[PDB]
């Protein structure tokens, strides 16, 4: 499979590495999302691993209903292409910007579905390591999907740990900042931060940005705040909310919710905050979502930010002075077609 087999429809998204497009497979008239990564950008250890693991997790995982599946992979001389399922309900950042705070029942719904996705990855020996509002999409019906798997640790034996300093500063866990080896615990910390954002309407470390001192609007100042400052819960939120946020945002991973090596996920299910959640029905997509995203027109482009969708539908012409400098050897055996 190649670029020939796809009718490019619209630009829908942009990461640091990637440009995202809506595409149609000419063979079947199914529409997919196409992540286009320029090889120009992938140069170090940290960059090749990002693509290789993203591919590996799409294969070995991603069968789950709250994870994005992969149609296929291919390359031109300049770019890597991932063809993945089109999910058209926006992301939780986009949704949070429209409705500044969420009700607790909405936050319960979204965090339950994430928890199942995380637990599924955890039991396949995978740490997500980049949970954030941007990486949690809503589908057309209003259920979540986790998307960006490039940061994942994999091949983790049960009770192993790893050492890499990665993630997103807002969501980074104290273990990582302390320089400790870490396991799945970092994912549960991130969920805590994520749940805080949904219920409170702002990050717990939101002061980092507003200060008169330039040196206190710094990644290093954020990391100091994550480690040493106490996270105050807003008075609005119930006793159950306050408990789960404080339990997930415990600075010690040993004593954090979700992180007992035996009973971790069970402890989450048994928390008063998730009293009335039917976890089997949740996982079978049988709990009616609290919000149905608006889908309009031929493709449902409503919930993608207009800056992306206005941009013209091309792939940028190549510059042969840059393309000739690329090591093609590093992307051999990239091609993949999903065994239908």
């Amino acid at each position: 499979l190649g670029l020939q087999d796809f009718d490019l429809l619209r630009v829908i998204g942009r990461g640091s590495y990637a440009k995202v497009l809506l595409v149609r497979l000419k063979k079947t008239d199914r529409i997919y999302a196409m992540k286009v990564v320029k090889k120009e950008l992938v140069n170090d250890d940290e960059d090749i691993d990002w693509v290789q693991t993203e591919k590996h997790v799409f294969e070995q995982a991603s069968n789950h209903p709250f994870l994005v599946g992969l149609h296929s992979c291919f390359q031109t001389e300049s770019r890597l292409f991932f063809v993945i399922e089109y999910v058209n309900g926006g992301d939780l950042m986009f949704h949070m910007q429209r409705q500044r705070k969420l009700p607790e029942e909405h936050a319960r719904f979204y965090s339950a579905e994430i928890s199942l996705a995380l637990n599924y990855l955890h039991e396949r020996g995978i740490i997500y390591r980049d949970l954030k509002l941007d990486n949690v999409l809503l589908d057309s019906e209003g259920h979540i999907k986790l998307t960006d798997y490039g940061m994942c640790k994999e091949g983790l034996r049960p009770g192993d740990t790893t050492s890499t300093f990665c993630g997103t500063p807002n969501y980074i866990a104290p273990e990582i900042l302390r320089g400790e080896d870490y396991g799945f615990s970092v994912d549960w910390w991130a969920l805590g931060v994520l749940m805080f954002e949904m219920m409170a309407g702002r990050s717990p470390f939101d002061i980092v940005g507003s200060s008169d001192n330039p040196d206190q609007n710094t990644e290093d100042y954020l990391f100091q705040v994550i480690l040493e400052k106490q996270i105050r819960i807003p008075r609005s939120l119930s006793v159950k909310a306050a408990s789960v946020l404080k339990s997930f945002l415990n600075k010690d991973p040993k004593e954090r919710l979700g992180c007992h090596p035996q009973t971790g996920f069970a402890d989450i299910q048994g928390h008063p905050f998730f009293r009335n959640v039917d976890w089997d029905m949740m996982e079978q997509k049988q709990v009616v979502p609290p919000f149905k995203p608006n889908i309009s027109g031929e493709f449902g482009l409503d919930n993608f930010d207009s800056q992306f969708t206005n941009e013209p539908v091309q792939l940028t012409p190549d510059d042969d002075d840059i393309v000739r400098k690329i090591d093609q050897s590093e992307f051999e055996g990239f091609e993949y077609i999903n065994p239908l």
Binding site: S16, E46, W50, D130, G167, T168, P169, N170, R202
Partner: peptide, 10 residues
């Protein structure tokens, strides 16, 4: 916030 919401790796 500041765009300390950007991913990274080291």
């Amino acid at each position: 916030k500041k765009s300390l919401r950007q991913s990274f790796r080291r």
